[PDB]
């Protein structure tokens, strides 16, 4: 999710890879020097010799500057000893592996060393500590054991590739001959080489009982944060660990700086009782613990989540108005207070501000604190509350408040790339739902900040004119203008369109229906638009790439694409591809998104189109695989960080779609009961709200979810479809409680799967025409928060509205499909099925 930062190429309206060397030569022979597919590592390879099926490996840790020497020093005591090693290929690589938000299990590992075996191991330990004795002690590797007092670390693990089906990394044991690889924040020795480990344990040569330490709040490569309780009191407090040379930021600052800068600037700000005050500070162990004054309550984000009203509750937004009044009024002086110390709050956003059960406001976390008037580029930028045209420290602090002013009124993230367009959208929304009163409060407070910025630097903003943006409630009007938008933003690269970051981050994401070109290609074909562009792209990109997409997934892989190809007349190609699917794999993934259910759904839809019984036989075989997989365990493993194991996309609700569909074509009642059951098991994990009348799902992580991906809207689609195939009206009461989500006021994001776009599906399920209109009209209000007028047409913001996207997952294609569903009264139209314009009629009872 933090990956979005990586895709903010400046001066683009789309998510695009931010482009950015550890040199060295005097390279001997059969020293083959290569990179990878596109990894961090640079392999220095010798000769040709089986390096063990696993073994004892050495990691050298280094710090950023030394690094250049640390490589030259170790590389020679490796080149001259003709040893095999890899190092992080460049500065960007070092940053990412050591940054504040790198994985703990992998950080610090700068150079990896592979000794032939245990003697040269227990001897490179020696000959390497020595060459790097005069070098600043770098980040500690938490997965490894430290050797003596050095930057040299060791662990037992794999030297190349060892995977257990889908089960992470491994190392071939003996009887089991697999043993998965424990990459963890501690040192987790195997067992079959326990012998050699203890050997090394004897050749390797009350200040925190002060407090009890129960829970951990958060971790992070910089350190941790704990739920403490100092006896001599019972004063619950918050302790901030700081591992030196660890969690690097973008300024070359380590997790030491941001504790003695959350010191130099926590000091000056001791004289303000909004701000946080410290307990002590000390160099306990090699680390550091700056104990913090504990503050009960919730962060603003958590308050918004639980207290901001989402249900259209007819009178009572004023409740929230006074609250935004209580809070923001203070904060406005609390920032005034701070500024007479000469010190900038650095990173102002709803995470770093707290709120009790009586609306008391305090600013925590001071890793970013700077000198007002100074323009050193800030440490961590929080996109959505900053802009890269503020030059001076102080200005930036106030701009954070500015953006945050509106945020509390309408909590919808935006970035300084899209805020130009969406300011119009949100202000008009606020005016419409709060009154001119609250609108005015906002405008001024935001002109106030404009003052306190003009104090610091040249900053003439552009002015109002809300009338320049108006809502569109005509479905056909929206479709057409979103289409033109897509037609107006064809890349002419392999992707066909700009989509989510999963385009670059995930297997097949440039091509597949979910974020790839197939999804826009498909949608353009539905509106009979851009035919030659679609053909060009199919002809010169897609076909060539098809045989190379590894996944069979409906959204993630080949099957979605095959739907497009078949509907475009490429029967032969689908035909050949199906010949290969029948065997391809019967995986353990049953999801609609990427598993056997989504594949089986496609297969059924192809059977309907072709009337060829081979495909029915294939659908039945897939069922048998799903059934068994369902038996393997009542759990779902996950891949995509936004996935959850409930609902129509990644949950059992989606598995039910397959069963319904298979029902429609077999007439076998057994499948119908499996469908009902799979729904049922999902309904069990819903939470009906007593206050407001709405059913949402409930995830493991104790989120309440409305959306198509993970939430109740999806569940409803599965019910609607069961009913459609069987002729029943099951779960009518839970169905009604889900459609009540129509009254939702806002969502953080806009998209089909994870945002406002989900709600569009609600109307396609309502059987009444008469309540369809009220409902349609409500969800269009939601959508108009996100619709962007641009030239003559519309474009659509991707996730978190930081950048535009045209894809199915987040972008305009997802929305176009949803709006066409409404028209057609088809809540399944976002599915990439063969001739999906006949599908409903062909599956109807």
């Amino acid at each position: 999710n933090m990956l979005y930062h990586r895709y903010l190429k400046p001066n683009s309206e789309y998510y695009k890879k931010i482009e950015v060397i550890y040199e060295l030569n005097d390279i001997p022979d059969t020293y083959a020097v290569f990179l990878d597919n596109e990894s961090v590592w640079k392999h220095y390879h010798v000769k040709g010799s089986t390096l063990p099926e696993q073994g004892w490996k050495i990691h050298v840790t280094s710090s950023l500057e030394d690094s250049k020497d640390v490589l030259d020093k170790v590389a020679r005591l490796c080149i001259d000893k003709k040893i095999e090693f890899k190092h992080l290929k460049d500065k960007d690589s070092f940053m990412k592996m050591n940054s504040k938000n790198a994985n703990r299990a992998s950080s610090g590992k700068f150079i990896t060393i592979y000794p032939t075996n245990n003697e040269v191991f227990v001897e490179l330990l020696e000959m390497i500590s020595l060459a790097i004795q005069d070098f600043k002690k770098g980040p500690y590797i938490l997965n490894d054991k430290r050797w003596k007092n050095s930057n040299v670390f060791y662990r037992y693990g794999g030297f190349k590739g060892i995977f257990n089906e889908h089960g992470e990394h491994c190392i071939r044991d003996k009887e089991g001959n697999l043993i998965k690889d424990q990459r963890n924040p501690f040192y987790q020795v195997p067992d079959f080489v326990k012998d050699f480990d203890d050997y090394l344990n004897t050749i390797n040569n009350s200040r925190l009982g002060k407090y009890k330490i129960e829970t951990a709040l958060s971790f992070s490569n910089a350190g941790g944060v704990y739920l403490a309780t100092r006896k001599k009191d019972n004063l619950k407090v918050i302790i901030k660990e700081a591992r030196p040379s660890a969690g690097l930021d973008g300024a070359a600052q380590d997790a030491l700086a941001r504790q003695k800068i959350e010191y130099d600037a926590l000091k000056k700000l001791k004289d303000v009782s909004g701000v946080v005050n410290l307990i002590e500070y000390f160099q306990e162990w090699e680390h550091y613990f700056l104990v913090e004054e504990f503050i009960e309550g919730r962060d603003l984000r958590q308050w918004i989540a639980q207290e901001f009203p989402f249900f259209e509750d007819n009178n009572g937004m004023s409740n929230h108005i006074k609250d935004v009044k209580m809070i923001l009024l203070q904060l406005l002086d609390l920032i005034d207070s701070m500024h007479n110390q000469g010190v900038a709050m650095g990173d102002l956003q709803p995470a770093n501000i707290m709120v009790t059960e009586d609306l008391t406001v305090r600013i925590i976390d001071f890793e970013t604190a700077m000198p007002v008037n100074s323009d050193d580029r800030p440490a961590m930028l929080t996109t959505g509350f900053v802009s890269h045209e503020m030059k001076v420290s102080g200005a930036r602090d106030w701009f954070g408040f500015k953006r945050l002013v509106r945020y509390l009124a309408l909590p919808v993230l935006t970035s300084e790339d899209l805020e130009g367009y969406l300011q119009y959208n949100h202000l008009n929304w606020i005016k419409e739902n709060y009154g001119y009163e609250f609108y005015s409060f906002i405008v001024d407070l935001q002109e106030k900040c404009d003052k306190r910025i003009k104090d610091y630097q040249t900053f003439i903003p552009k002015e109002i004119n809300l009338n320049d943006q108006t809502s569109d409630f005509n479905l056909t009007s929206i479709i057409n203008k979103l289409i033109i938008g897509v037609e107006s933003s064809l890349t002419n690269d392999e992707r066909f369109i700009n989509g989510d970051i999963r385009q670059f981050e995930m297997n097949g994401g440039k091509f597949n229906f979910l974020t790839g070109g197939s999804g826009a290609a498909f949608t353009l074909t539905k509106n009979k638009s851009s035919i030659a562009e679609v053909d060009k792209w199919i002809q010169s990109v897609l076909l060539d790439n098809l045989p190379l997409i590894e996944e069979d997934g409906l959204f993630t892989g080949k099957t979605g694409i095959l739907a497009l190809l078949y509907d475009k007349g490429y029967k032969e190609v689908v035909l050949n591809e199906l010949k290969i699917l029948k065997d391809n794999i019967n995986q353990t993934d049953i999801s609609i998104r990427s598993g056997l259910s989504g594949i089986g759904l496609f297969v059924i839809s192809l059977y309907l189109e072709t009337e060829n019984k081979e495909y029915l036989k294939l659908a039945k075989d897939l069922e048998r695989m799903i059934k068994l997989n369902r038996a393997k365990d009542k759990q779902l493993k996950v891949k995509d960080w936004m996935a959850v194991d409930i609902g129509v996309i990644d949950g059992l609700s989606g598995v039910s779609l397959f069963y319904s569909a298979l029902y429609s074509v077999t007439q076998n009642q057994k499948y119908l009961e499996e469908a009902e059951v799979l729904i049922k098991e999902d309904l069990e994990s819903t939470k009906k709200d007593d206050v407001t009348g709405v059913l949402q799902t409930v995830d493991n992580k104790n989120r309440l979810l409305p959306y198509l991906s993970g939430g109740s809207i999806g569940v409803a689609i599965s019910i609607w479809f069961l009913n459609h195939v069987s002729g029943q009206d099951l779960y009518r009461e839970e169905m009604n409680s889900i459609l009540k989500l129509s009254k939702t006021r806002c969502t953080i994001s806009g998209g089909l799967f994870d945002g406002a776009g989900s709600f569009l599906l609600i109307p396609s399920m309502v059987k009444n025409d008469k309540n369809r209109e009220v409902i349609l009209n409500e969800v269009l209000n939601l959508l108009n928060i996100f619709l962007i007028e641009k030239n003559s047409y519309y474009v659509y913001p991707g996730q978190f509205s930081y950048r535009l996207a045209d894809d199915v997952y987040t972008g305009s294609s997802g929305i176009i499909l949803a709006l066409m569903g409404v028209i057609k009264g088809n809540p399944l139209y976002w599915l990439p099925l063969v001739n999906s314009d006949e599908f409903l009629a062909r599956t109807k009872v």
Binding site: R104, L142, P185, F186, L208, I213, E214, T215, A216, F219, G224, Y226, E241, E284, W285, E286, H287
Partner: peptide, 14 residues
């Protein structure tokens, strides 16, 4: 000493 400081990294969550 470092049996605690490192054992902390091991501690509770949700």
């Amino acid at each position: 000493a470092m049996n605690t400081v490192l054992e902390l990294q091991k501690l509770a969550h949700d």
